[PDB]
Design a protein around this ligand. Structure first.
Ligand code: 5B4
Ligand code: 5B4
Lengths: 297, 297
């Protein structure tokens, strides 16, 4: 039971939400089929009805246990941010349900193969080295696009990239994760306080808490490493409190077994201690494209 | 076009600069908006970004026309000297940009009301006698602090005190000045040779070119006089070449119109021909505090 005063929301926000509102008899939420639980609420399988009558399989993200109007606001703006991107390697929005009674909803296209991290860890799938380089390239393209819209991601990692039925990677800001044998996704970050994924963070972000596109580039480097190790945890035998010093000493993730030398060289350029010396996403797309092009497998 | 060998700088200096480094990701230099031109280079309006997102209005001091590595060194040490002071009446440092390619930068907080001399001369502002005594007191407090760190200023005068949006005086070593109708600051001292502001200098400094805290006390006396006359030039009818003799004869700046007797008495004690007989800044803070406290206006 939720009653929301719509008049207490920013009116421009409400108007933006109206441009992507979902029809009254188009969405079915399968409460029986949970995808995950977060601090915000639940994510369900759902079935949206096309402007024609067609049945679209989607993921319904629902806001539950609401305590204040600011929480509704943030939920809705996150939704609106992703409405104004349009790129095959960035996860798109199907719609939003905002009513004065009941949980607000954000509806997303269903991603057949879930998150990229569980996919590359899954032993039934045998993604080849070339494939993994392919996935890293599609990610670079998504970040290249987002960096062109001056959007800073802050939480790039394999767990936040989804993978669709055509094996297209959609960069996303899911915030949830799951284990190999878990049926359901759960929250990665704490309910309150800053989102700090230490082992994906740039040296300067660890020190100053300031995130930039150039720090997304670092996280990408780490994301590449995940791909080439098929989802190994980074710096496993290092405590999250010692990471900073470890980096300051000049140590870096080591070359994974079947990772090509020039791709590992890309990862290092991503981890350059000076941000402005790291490559842009545009340069990464070109470098990794060249590598992919000349790779045999 | 300038390229600097960082390895040719003292390594401790470079390490100190690292503790206050700014990212080329955070500073915007408005080359279109010049504040002043000196022999070192230019000062621009600029916009620095807070460690997460806030836009800070600053002044960017840039080193241009560099001929040798010693010049870079001095520029940078001046910056570092002012990083290790911390006092509300001493101008602080926002940061330094030191890169191999391009002009080195020192970034400072923007002072809404510019230098103290132009402020008290400005007829749109009607600072009362009490206010002016207030400004002199804030200066004494700044010098008191600097004298406790064994720092000798050498060039204290109203033109080198800045004034912020709360009307706090920041003692500084700006080195620049401007006229009532000039839109832009210019150099006070010659390109080459010693910085010698004759009408603010202690008798012994005029003779021996040695500067001490006790000679800063003299300059302060003169600075007080500027304040009480709302920025009149000192010894106007005296040539800079005859000042020494004039002082040797025992003559001193006269009592300004609405200056209180006991504050003028403070100024004289500052101009005592024997340095060790002048008051310390700590004594000046007490004396002027008492005067300010019992002043009605
Ligand atoms: C088999 N399987 C299918 C699934 C499955 C699970 C799904 O759940 C979600 C996935 C998300 F990515 C978000 N994301 C979000 O809610 C937001 C988001 O994506 N932000 C954002 C996006 C792109 C940007 F560039 C920048 C920001 C608004 C935060 C939510 C979800 F519920 C969805 C589809 N499919 C899981 N397993
Ligand atoms: C409206 N308006 C605002 C403005 C305006 C102009 C500004 O220009 C500057 C002011 C300075 F004081 C320095 N100072 C310096 O560069 C140094 C300095 O201050 N050293 C120092 C400082 C304090 C000490 F106790 C001892 C030494 C290193 C020499 C530089 C500047 F570019 C800045 C802000 N605001 C001018 N008009």
């Amino acid at each position: 039971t939720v009653h929301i005063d719509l008049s207490a929301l920013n009116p421009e926000l409400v108007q933006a939400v109206q441009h992507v509102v979902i029809g009254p008899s188009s969405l079915i939420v399968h409460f029986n089929e949970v995808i995950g639980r977060g601090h915000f609420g639940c994510v369900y399988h759902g079935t949206l009805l096309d402007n024609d009558g067609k049945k679209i399989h989607c993921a319904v993200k629902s806001l539950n246990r609401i305590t204040d109007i600011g929480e509704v606001s943030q939920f809705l703006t996150e939704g609106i941010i992703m409405k104004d991107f349009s790129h095959p390697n960035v996860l798109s929005l199907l719609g939003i349900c905002l009513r004065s009674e009941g949980s607000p909803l954000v509806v997303l296209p269903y991603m057949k193969h879930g998150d990229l991290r569980n996919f590359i860890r899954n032993e039934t799938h045998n993604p080849t080295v070339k494939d993994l380089i392919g996935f890293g390239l599609q990610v670079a393209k998504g970040m290249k696009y987002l960096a062109s819209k001056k959007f800073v991601h802050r939480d790039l990692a394999a767990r936040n990239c989804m993978l669709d039925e055509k094996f297209t990677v959609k960069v996303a800001d899911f915030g949830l994760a799951r284990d190999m044998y878990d049926k359901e996704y759960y929250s990665v970050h704490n309910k309150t306080g800053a989102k700090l994924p230490v082992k994906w963070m740039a040296l300067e972000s660890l020190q100053t808490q300031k995130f930039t596109t150039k720090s997304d580039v670092w996280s990408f480097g780490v994301l590449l490493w995940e791909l080439m190790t098929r989802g190994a945890p980074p710096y496993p035998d290092v405590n999250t409190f010692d990471i900073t010093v470890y980096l300051l000493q000049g140590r870096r993730l080591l070359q994974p077994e079947y990772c090509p030398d020039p791709l590992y060289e890309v990862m290092l350029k991503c981890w350059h201690p000076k941000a402005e010396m790291r490559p842009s996403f545009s340069e990464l797309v070109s470098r990794i494209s060249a590598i992919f092009s000349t790779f045999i497998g």
